[model samples]
Target: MKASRLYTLVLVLQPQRVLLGMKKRGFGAGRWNGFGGKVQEGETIEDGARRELQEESGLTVDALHKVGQIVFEFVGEPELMDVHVFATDSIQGTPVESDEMRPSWFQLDQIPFKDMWPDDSYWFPLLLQKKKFHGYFKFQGQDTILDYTLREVDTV
Candidate 1:
């Protein structure tokens, strides 16, 4: 793709639980995933992550660390998605439903991988392990990952 847009995704982790959002509408609707969206003009990635998380899940991130980067390409789409992934254990507020999402917490072992982005299963374990990662995924559509690569790294 010749053009790309920056986006962010933040996962909130706690002792044995993780926070996820059931997207209610738009791009990833019907799927469970982290909370975030496109980075607006003049906004840093982290700032965008925080804003999106609050807007979607009603949580304020107290501390967030960048852990991964994933470049996503849809087979027939010309725009690439540059996603910056972040994770945090520090947050405030109980999850609340919003027009865009319904928030919920799941046990670490019970993450609904079947209902998430196809590439999530490949890199989520690394996040839970406290390891940083970088990945790339090309999708034939929403359900099939046509090609991908993922690796743990010292930094995103």
Candidate 2:
């Protein structure tokens, strides 16, 4: 069976820092990363990204740039999560906590990678350098990276 689901992940970055949210309690609970969730059918992927960012953190952006794409696979699950990653330095308002996430800012030099998804360490540097890319990660359960491939691409 072909089982794939669309999702979004937004990175709010600035010259010195990046804004990330800690997953409150759910699939990704306890990781510090960009705000995102499942994409809805009624909206475009970009729109879905914008909506999830808004719902998870009280910040809004007029434009978001496509930075990366990743497909996360687990050994036993039939569903594959296809996540489109976006980044935006320009934004409005302030980030506020929600039931889904607790927003926080970390300097580019001090991102909490130890407290984030294992796949993040592999791909986030490409994002910080503003390079578009694509990746695939195979996870053993939720916390360990079994194997993966990541490549810098011309387009995301």
Candidate 3:
């Protein structure tokens, strides 16, 4: 059987140099990451990301740039996630927490590496360089990596 395709949205805010939002709970609890959630039926990828950010972070991107994608498979749950990553130069509103997340920010030089997935340190360099990327990752959890790969983003 094919694994479930979970959707995720991540945004890199430049100049501000902050990764927004915090984990109220779950696999990456208390970690600082981007704003987003699962994709719903009939929702386009960009729409889903935009919706999640507004709903969860109470912020909208003035201009969002699609930077990359990452595919991750959880070893035990028969689940896979396709994380759609975007970058934005500006954001609107003060971020607030919903039931799931607590809004926060991390300076670029002070990212919470221990709280984020190990793979972030890898592809993030590409994001910082303004280059797009595609990544594959296998993890038992945040702290463990079974396997992974990264490639320059391009049409196949």
Candidate 4:
């Protein structure tokens, strides 16, 4: 399926932990994951990532590096999701709860994958290792990944 929309997801890394937000609603609600959202028409991908991080967690990313990209297709859905993943070690501001999310930090080895998008587990390790990747996932529903492919690449 062709990609119908583009989105961004960001992971904020510290010495041995990563910042994740509890999505309050909408796609991936009740899960702990990176902070990001749809790329607006007049915004560049990096700008969108920064904007979303601020909007969701009250943090301003100082530097963001492209780390991965994933394409998701649901069994009965016509639109494909093209998500660009970014990572950063530098940011400013304290995380605050928002209408859309609540932020928290987790140890590198303790991410809450059970509550996240099913495909996240397949590629999250690559991100923690600072490796770039490209992936594709076909889902039967939100909790089931019917088929997937993930590769560690030199660049996203």
Candidate 5:
């Protein structure tokens, strides 16, 4: 499963709080992270992000600002997660828990990095600043980033 696959992650935001999800099962289960999923064949990446958000959090966003691109590589027995990250403040519907996610809001200064992917700490500061970025992380496991590169970009 190390072959690369396209994935999407959408960060739902309000003025002070950002929406994140606790993965209840599968993949990043138990991690507090953004709401998103794999991009299917027919839909566009942004479309996939919106759909995944609706599925996991029971909400819809009108527009998503492309914020970052992340290449997440695991050592073995896992897929290369090529993730497109988006942020949006135009939210609709009430966020509710799903089989895969438990949606929660955290203030900008209160993100639980210790309970999230290690690479998140490297780029989340940029995300908070509305800076587009690119990140590549080669990991030994969940908590250890063996090698990585992160940069602020003018565009995604």
Candidate 6:
């Protein structure tokens, strides 16, 4: 079996803030992170990322740089997830709230990782380093990560 596939975008704004979405319910709640969702049928990963960004953030991207990808299978879960990450420096307009996401700006120094997933602190460092990476992880609960492994990725 394969993990679920999700397309994600990391939009960078000036002053070192990343545009993140707020999930008010479910596993991810009251946290800040990018704009994205599952890839739809017949749509490319990039297109899905773009679409999610627009739908959630109300911003248009001028250019997007492919950062990397990751695949992870949850323990006891029948599905795996292929996560496509993109870094975009170009953006316009203001972020708005949606049913799925409440848009917010998070400062580099003021990120609410305490309210975010435990794995975020691990890999987000690499993202801040501007280094692409791939990884697998096992999560036990909302903030407890059972196991994880990561490696640097080179984008062509």
TM-score per candidate: 0.96, 0.97, 0.89, 0.95, 0.95, 0.87
Q: Rank the candidates by lDDT, best first.
A: 2, 1, 5, 4, 3, 6
Q: Could you tell me which residue pairs clash in candidate 6?
A: 2-80, 3-79, 3-80, 3-81, 4-80, 20-33
lDDT by residue for model 5 (92-139), tens? 988999999988889977989999987898898898888999999998
* Cand. 3 Cα-lDDT: 0.76
Model 4 scores a TM of 0.95
Identify the leading candidate in terms of lDDT: 2
What's the lDDT for all of these models? 0.91, 0.92, 0.76, 0.88, 0.89, 0.73
Please list all clashing residue pairs in model 2, or write none if there are none.
Answer: none
Cα-based RMSD of the predictions, in order?
Answer: 1.0, 0.9, 1.9, 1.1, 1.6, 2.0
Badly placed stretches (over 4 Å) of model 2 are none
Clash totals for all candidate models: 0, 0, 0, 0, 0, 6
Candidate 2, run of 10 with poorest lDDT: 1-10
Better of 4 and 5 by TM-score: 4
Error of 6 at 74 (Å): 2.3
lDDT of 2 by residue, 29-147 (tens): 99998989899978999999999999999888988899999999998988999999999999899999999999999999999999999899989998888789999998998888888
> Tens digit of lDDT per residue, candidate 6, span 88-131?
76788877787778887778898778776677777778888888
After best superposition, candidate 3 residue 18: deviation in angstroms? 1.4
Worst 10 residues of 3 by lDDT: 1-10
Error of 1 at 155 (Å): 1.5
Candidate 4: residue 156 lDDT (0-100): 75
